[PDB]
Design a protein around this ligand. Sequence first.
Ligand SMILES: Cc1cc2nc3c(=O)[nH]c(=O)nc-3n(C[C@H](O)[C@H](O)[C@H](O)COP(=O)(O)OP(=O)(O)OC[C@H]3O[C@@H](n4cnc5c(N)ncnc54)[C@H](O)[C@@H]3O)c2cc1C
Ligand SMILES: [Zn+2]
Ligand SMILES: [Zn+2]
Length: 741
Amino acid sequence: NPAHAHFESFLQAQLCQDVLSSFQELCGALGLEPGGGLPQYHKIKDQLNYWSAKSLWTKLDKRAGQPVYQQGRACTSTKCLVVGAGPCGLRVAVELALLGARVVLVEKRTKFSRHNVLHLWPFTIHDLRALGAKKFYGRFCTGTLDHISIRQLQLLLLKVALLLGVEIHWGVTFTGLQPPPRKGSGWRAQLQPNPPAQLANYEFDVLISAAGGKFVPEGFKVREMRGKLAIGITANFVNGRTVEETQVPEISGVARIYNQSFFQSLLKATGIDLENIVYYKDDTHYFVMTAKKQCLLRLGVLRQDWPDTNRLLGSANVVPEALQRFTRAAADFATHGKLGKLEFAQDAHGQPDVSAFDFTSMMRAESSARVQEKHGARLLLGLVGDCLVEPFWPLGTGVARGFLAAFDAAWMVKRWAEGAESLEVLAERESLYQLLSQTSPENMHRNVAQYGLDPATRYPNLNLRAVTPNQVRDLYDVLGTQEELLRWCQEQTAGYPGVHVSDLSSSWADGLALCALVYRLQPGLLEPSELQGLGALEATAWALKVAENELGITPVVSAQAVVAGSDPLGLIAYLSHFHSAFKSMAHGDLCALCGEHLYVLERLCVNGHFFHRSCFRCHTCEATLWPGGYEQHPGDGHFYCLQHLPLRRAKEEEMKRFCKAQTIQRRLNEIEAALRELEAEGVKLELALRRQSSSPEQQKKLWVGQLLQLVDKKNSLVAEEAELMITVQELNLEEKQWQLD
Ligand SMILES: Cc1cc2nc3c(=O)[nH]c(=O)nc-3n(C[C@H](O)[C@H](O)[C@H](O)COP(=O)(O)OP(=O)(O)OC[C@H]3O[C@@H](n4cnc5c(N)ncnc54)[C@H](O)[C@@H]3O)c2cc1C
Ligand SMILES: [Zn+2]
Ligand SMILES: [Zn+2]
């Protein structure tokens, strides 16, 4: 059989174009009518008598015999379409095909020319070799290697899927869904430029999308997650597979808190600042980095200081030659020269493999499902992979998250196909989406040899009813705090002579109100006899000091403006501190380092002195100085920090500590972005709130209302990152003990 001859040409291919040629040859021939559908598989093991293939069939049988498989009669009438052929899209197509639906895939690209590396969770490893992954790549999961290139996995899963009768039209660009003409008709899809007829009229009632990060489908809004600007570089080197490079240890990567010693060493060697570097020794060596803009400008890698991240990535703007030099230097300095000679990776384009990319902003989807019904037709929309959850690249969570999304989509579509209505399925999928953001090898089951599609075996104790049906009516489509703060103040005033509370401000400048407040904050702090023995300036200084000593709450107002009383908003915030402190348990005005008045959104006191928040940085390393790691020089008043003052479980815990450190750093970047945005908003609002301090009483109450809302939000957050920072010093601490070990 010439058809069977091209079958071994197929199953023995190593390049994508060869797979395409074999498929096209079978398309021209009429030997077996390739890819006609699922039943092909049930006849395909018949006319094959090579012993070496047994395991393949065996494994697929052991994968096609689960009761959850319904023996293939699950959703037979149903008909589907997958846009996107990454690992996630291939998993969606193949798994949805297994249960029996008609499956077609489309791709604008036609050649497997992505040569970078991907990281896989253990469940991804087991589920990936469940499809007989041994056959298509010899070195798969060989020992401790747990990292597979994009094209390798792409080819493996594509060959597996093509053994299971999936239909593909390459060179096809998705651009929308054609509305039904009339009653009883389903949804067609717009594809370009000119797909063949057999798909052009192929009509479907299910669509699961894996378009990736750059494309999201109709009917979904997008949210942006942003941080401080950071650019990254991806580099590759064609490996000679030599022993000298093979014996090289694989540094798991470097993060700012994670290897401060490594940054110090690389600065001493060559004075180069990075933010993150990770090194992968697969077939072609992978180097992923992110770093600091002015260190990157130091070598001139950029010519013009363009704020726009994508346009900063502009090739005309980017100095490529400097990029190659910097990549080479970063590599050979990171690996400590035992690589010896290095040669650039020859890409598909015809050049070295280097590129400049983004590590800051990520798209996100609030909703992972949409059932749209028209002309008596129920249509389902779901997202799998990066289109739903676009991750931080190097965390390596993309493939695992996409495969979890694939299982979610398969389960939910098979549930809806059985006549189940919209409410329960959308509720279930939103219930799993609420947990998807915290997927982790940690919160997964400890042993992995019994997984599948059933959501009960993947999320222990899943409250599937997390979202009531009535919440998704939108997802179905057919055609003055000052009053309450004051009231709390009176509640803290019961039985006090000489304390005549009338507003938020005038009743506190007396001074004894501070003592009464701290009294009922915690009983036994002071004897009642001495209550009438303090002076007003002394009383307010004492109250501030005791509040910092007992609760450690941040002062907002100094004693001079207290007795002056002309800036009540600070005292409002200061009382608001305790207003939020008991919400459950009890139910020189300028700056020199910033040359500006401490405008309240950035006004802060530095151990009994008055400077801005932004100006508080180390002159050497221009970082934020948190308690336990800095100490002020009294000679000049400048602010300086400390150094700146002139076996399987082993690798498992190493990876876990890397991931947790990086997560901490990313969280700090997120908080910094949030603080900058909120302080800009507060600046623009307080412009009026100070200038236009004569609004209507309702307007004045509203302004101060969100002023309090915002300041209380900062209080809660700064507490949260205070505890996170404390986690940082303690993690450095047992790093010191581990070095001591
Ligand atoms: C250049 C690059 C480098 C990357 N490097 C890394 C890395 O080092 N580490 C890492 O963990 N992750 C990396 N990723 C992301 C990686 O894709 C995911 O993190 C993970 O591999 C999940 O892969 P995926 O299935 O999301 O691929 P996808 O993003 O789903 O692949 C995009 C797919 O959508 C298809 N598509 C898009 N538009 C259309 C259309 N109109 N019609 C038909 N098909 C369409 C594309 O052709 C392609 O098949 C990288 C991504 C890119 C683009
Ligand atoms: Zn200052
Ligand atoms: Zn410093």
